[PDB]
Amino acid sequence: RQWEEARALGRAVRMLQRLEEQCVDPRLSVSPPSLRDLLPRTAQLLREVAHSRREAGGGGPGGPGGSGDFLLIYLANLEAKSRQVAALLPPRGRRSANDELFRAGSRLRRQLAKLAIIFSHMHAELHALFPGGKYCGHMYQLTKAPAHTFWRESCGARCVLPWAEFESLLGTCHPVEPGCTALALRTTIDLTCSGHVSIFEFDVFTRLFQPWPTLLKNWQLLAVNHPGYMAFLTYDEVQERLQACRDKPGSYIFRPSCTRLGQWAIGYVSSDGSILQTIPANKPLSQVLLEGQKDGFYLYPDGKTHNPDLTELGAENLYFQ
């Protein structure tokens, strides 16, 4: 067994090249995430992976959760996702279509941004686990130590896990309420919508919802139950959303940055009525919103009046840091 993976990688690369052709419409995109930057970016990185592994004693061990297993799943998913984009914006292209695909607020536009985000996340994961094509998943270090401790004691050297096993493991540390809560969490953690959670995906989430002792609490209070939290939005979408709230200076919404993974992008309307977006480093989100509230910048989630009191959570988070 030497050539299956190579064929897989080649199949993917060709498909990315073919999909790049279908993204012929000018209105794409071009602000990050842009499928048009991402596709050839991801293609070349795949070539490097292909090439780095012709000549490989590596990387790492090769049971489930190793590099070979990771790629099997990763490529399968990339292909799946590519088909969805194929179906959305055919054909070669042909003319200039579809007009709805680029109306702010439209459904297709959202379907497209969500796919564009998935591609950004798919590339980010590969770049993190195979920098320059060279696998480091057996050595990768999570940013928050307690997260790191967890991942290595639970998962060992593995870089990737099926959702079910991951949930079970996370559960024995922070209990995950079954049903709609467990589903919401899965949707938040599984950035690639692959059915598996990578050491990278986990790095993103544990950074976003630090500190560790309140991991799920933060996710629950600041994402699931906060009206200012906007799951999986692009920058341009934020700009579009807040257009209505330009009346109410102090209106704000937040989401994960797409280009600085692990970090938040707060979007607020200024005094002037200008829509500004800022990425804070590197505080918990509870600290970020409290200070922005206390300074008059972050007052009205989604342009609405009910701003959850986070006083206790913020205090709790400083205590645990």
Binding site: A265, Y268, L276, T278
Partner: peptide, 10 residues
Amino acid sequence: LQRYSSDPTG
């Protein structure tokens, strides 16, 4: 314009 403005909390 620049994309991501300065943190307004300092």
